[PDB]
Scaffold this active site. Structure first.
Site, short mmCIF file in Angstrom:
data_model
loop_
_atom_site.label_atom_id
_atom_site.label_comp_id
_atom_site.label_asym_id
_atom_site.label_seq_id
_atom_site.Cartn_x
_atom_site.Cartn_y
_atom_site.Cartn_z
N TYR A 21 1.07 -1.60 -0.15
CA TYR A 21 -0.67 0.03 -0.11
C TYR A 21 1.04 1.34 0.26
O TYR A 21 2.23 1.49 -0.09
CB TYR A 21 -1.13 -0.39 1.17
N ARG A 67 -6.68 2.42 3.37
CA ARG A 67 -7.54 1.56 3.68
C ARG A 67 -6.12 0.21 4.23
O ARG A 67 -6.95 -1.43 4.03
CB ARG A 67 -7.48 0.90 1.72
N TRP A 101 -10.94 11.20 -2.87
CA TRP A 101 -9.94 11.71 -2.65
C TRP A 101 -9.05 11.87 -3.54
O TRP A 101 -8.39 12.98 -3.22
CB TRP A 101 -9.81 10.08 -2.06
O1 LIG Z 1 -6.48 9.70 0.33
C1 LIG Z 1 -6.60 8.92 0.05
N1 LIG Z 1 -5.62 8.26 -0.78
C2 LIG Z 1 -5.36 8.63 -2.24
C3 LIG Z 1 -3.76 7.68 -2.35
C4 LIG Z 1 -2.98 8.77 -2.85
N2 LIG Z 1 -2.57 9.23 -1.97
C5 LIG Z 1 -1.24 8.30 -1.11
C6 LIG Z 1 -0.07 9.31 -0.68
F1 LIG Z 1 0.78 9.54 -2.03
F2 LIG Z 1 0.14 10.78 -0.21
F3 LIG Z 1 1.52 8.55 -0.74
C7 LIG Z 1 -3.57 9.98 -0.79
C8 LIG Z 1 -4.82 9.86 -1.45
C9 LIG Z 1 -7.42 7.81 1.18
C10 LIG Z 1 -8.10 7.10 0.14
C11 LIG Z 1 -9.15 5.63 0.90
C12 LIG Z 1 -9.19 6.01 2.54
C13 LIG Z 1 -9.29 5.66 3.29
C14 LIG Z 1 -10.63 4.53 3.14
C15 LIG Z 1 -11.66 4.07 3.84
C16 LIG Z 1 -11.72 4.36 4.95
C17 LIG Z 1 -10.69 4.56 5.81
F4 LIG Z 1 -10.50 5.64 6.95
C18 LIG Z 1 -9.93 5.97 4.81
N3 LIG Z 1 -7.98 7.28 3.36
C19 LIG Z 1 -7.06 8.36 2.09
N1 LIG Z 2 -12.36 -1.28 -2.32
C1 LIG Z 2 -11.25 -0.66 -2.21
C2 LIG Z 2 -10.97 -0.17 -3.60
C3 LIG Z 2 -8.82 0.27 -3.35
C4 LIG Z 2 -8.59 1.93 -4.09
O1 LIG Z 2 -9.48 2.01 -5.17
N2 LIG Z 2 -7.31 1.61 -3.68
C5 LIG Z 2 -7.07 3.34 -4.10
C6 LIG Z 2 -5.59 3.60 -2.98
S1 LIG Z 2 -7.24 4.47 -1.08
C7 LIG Z 2 -6.05 3.11 -4.95
O2 LIG Z 2 -6.10 1.55 -5.73
N3 LIG Z 2 -5.78 4.31 -5.86
C8 LIG Z 2 -4.73 3.85 -7.08
C9 LIG Z 2 -5.41 3.98 -8.11
O3 LIG Z 2 -6.56 4.08 -8.61
O4 LIG Z 2 -4.38 4.36 -9.83
C10 LIG Z 2 -10.38 -1.44 -1.05
O5 LIG Z 2 -10.74 -1.62 0.12
O6 LIG Z 2 -8.97 -2.21 -1.58
#
Ligand SMILES: O=C(NC1CCN(CC(F)(F)F)CC1)c1ccc(-c2cccc(F)c2)nc1
Ligand SMILES: N[C@H](CCC(=O)N[C@@H](CS)C(=O)NCC(=O)O)C(=O)O
Ligand SMILES: O=C(NC1CCN(CC(F)(F)F)CC1)c1ccc(-c2cccc(F)c2)nc1
Ligand SMILES: N[C@H](CCC(=O)N[C@@H](CS)C(=O)NCC(=O)O)C(=O)O
Ligand SMILES: [Mg+2]
Lengths: 198, 198
Positions: B7, B13, B103
């Protein structure tokens, strides 16, 4: 048990439950509410959403949580624990995408732009990943039909309403839809259920 | 089994998986990628999203599918099949809400205003329904901790980042957060984990 399913008059998020009941030959009350009585009934629900399933007075919510509950210890579940994980993962991947659609958006231009963007950009990638995942195998997971196969048929039926050419390059996915539809109990349900757009 | 969790460098997540590993005292590799590594990694994954968990080299996906897999036959799953349904339902209610936040929305202030609307207009309603569901009891489901309580604690932690007053009308939900946080294996992970904003 005495099962009462409550949802709108549409396939929508209740249909997976309805396929499972059909497939397992389990009697239930398929209760469809009037949008008329919706604002009033909404206040009685645990988290204000439907479907709910009442089982001997006890209320259950969340369609996929209910679906998994009903398929536990049945032949729809997944045979190994790893297979059950794959069933769950495929179901959530499908559900993630269907939940992206702004179904209750009032502003029509905004709604149409969003639906079109999702259908023309995001949907084909998902179709591609599912098809590759499926490969030349008969069902999505394991040796036999699971409720992930039901959910594939359900979701893609709705997608095909908005994008009829969705599966033009995915004959193996069309074949799977037809396999699910060929299951006698499912075929019977599909012929008997109310005909709704969604 | 050999477990490798992949991750981004955030709770996000993946965190629910990390709490479960911590609680069950399972060794795993906590692989935190940077955005620059993502394009290459993404192209190798069946469904192109993270988190993934490699179990002896076999890639599983979908955070909650993985979470349920890891808790199967443990005291975190729920004792009965009905309790397991309730756990699953509360988890999807929380996840549904968290997934509403845009997000990765490219346009700012459609993102900032959707955030304010969700937090101001919708979050309180959900907190109320959660409190009502908890109904003065010690844990969300049954008489002992489940991974629903973990996920409550994880999701609320992130909501509190953006809305410090989230639980000011809900001291019983604050009490539940603290109770999860005091579980020794969870307390230990919370003090040792990388400190990230999200
Ligand atoms: O903002 C989110 N993700 C993106 C991905 C790229 N980046 C990562 C980087 F680039 F910073 F490494 C930041 C922006 C994000 C996404 C989901 C959730 C979440 C979902 C469910 C429960 C929960 F509690 C939290 N929380 C934050
Ligand atoms: N249903 C979610 C889906 C996961 C998801 O959409 N994760 C995001 C990060 S929070 C991701 O892979 N983003 C990068 C991309 O879509 O290319 C899970 O709980 O696994
Ligand atoms: O049309 C839909 N929802 C409307 C929204 C407005 N209203 C509610 C109100 F506002 F009246 F309360 C009537 C119902 C709808 C929603 C979801 C899916 C769906 C979800 C998962 C899988 C899948 F295949 C389909 N399909 C249709
Ligand atoms: N996670 C979904 C949530 C259910 C949901 O949001 N259902 C919609 C209808 S499809 C609903 O009750 N919306 C009406 C409202 O919010 O007032 C599930 O599968 O149960
Ligand atoms: Mg979900």
């Amino acid at each position: 048990p005495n099962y009462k399913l409550t949802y709108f008059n549409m396939r929508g998020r209740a249909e997976i439950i309805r396929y499972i009941f059909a497939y397992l030959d389990i009697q239930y009350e398929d209760h469809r509410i009037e949008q008329a009585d919706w604002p009033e009934i909404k206040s009685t629900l645990p988290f204000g959403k439907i479907p709910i399933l009442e089982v001997d007075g006890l209320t259950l919510h969340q369609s996929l949580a209910i679906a998994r509950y009903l398929t536990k210890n049945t032949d729809l579940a997944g045979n190994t624990e790893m297979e059950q994980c794959h069933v769950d993962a495929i179901v959530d991947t499908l559900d993630d995408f269907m939940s992206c659609f702004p179904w209750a958006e009032k502003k029509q231009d905004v709604k149409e732009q969003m639906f079109n963007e999702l259908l023309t950009y995001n949907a084909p990638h998902l179709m591609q990943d599912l098809d590759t995942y499926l490969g030349g195998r008969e069902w999505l997971i394991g040796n036999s039909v699971t409720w992930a196969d039901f959910y594939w048929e359900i979701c893609s039926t709705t997608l095909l309403v908005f994008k009829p050419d969705l599966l033009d390059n995915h004959p193996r996915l069309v074949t799977l839809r037809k396999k699910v539809q060929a299951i006698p109990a499912v075929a019977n349900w599909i012929k008997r259920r109310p005909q709704t757009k969604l």
